Amino acid sequence: KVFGRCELAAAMKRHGLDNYRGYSLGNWVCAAKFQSNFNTQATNRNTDGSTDYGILQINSRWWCNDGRTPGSRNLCNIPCSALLSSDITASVNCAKKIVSDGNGMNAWVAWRNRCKGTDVQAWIRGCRL
Ligand SMILES: *[C@H]1O[C@H](CO)[C@@H](O[C@@H]2O[C@H](CO)[C@@H](O)[C@H](O)[C@H]2NC(C)=O)[C@H](O)[C@H]1F
Ligand code: NA
Structure with a gap:
């Protein structure tokens, strides 16, 4: 699914990311934009052989199991x-x-x-939320 900007902002808020660990919603939206272009199906191989998955490009080296990242962990306990x-x-x-x-x-x-220190609030501008 390719989310629209405001549609993703709303989903992230409903799932508790706005201000999670102190990070305002626009931080999350900005990170999602540059890492996946808001596409949940995005995958990209890393030089070390791990792969990044999804809207937030979460890495198999530590966080999920993909069965092909030697020596890795699955700290989030998910495929x-x-x-x-x-x-x-x-x-x-x-x-x-x-x-x-x-x-x-x-x-x-x-x-x-690309996001840190910038005007991330711009990423949620105009959004009903
Ligand atoms: C793609 O991007 C992700 C996120 O920037 C990278 O994963 C990071 O990898 C570092 C070093 O392996 C690890 O310390 C971080 O926990 C991890 N972050 C996430 C969100 O998984 C990945 O290396 C790249 F392929
Ligand atoms: Na893994």
């Missing part, structure tokens, strides 16, 4: 495929664990490089 669903529940729940891991949203490289 990485769950992160590709039109229902963002698994992606959100896993993202809550990731953002609580110690480094906040710096766990998402694209957020650090």
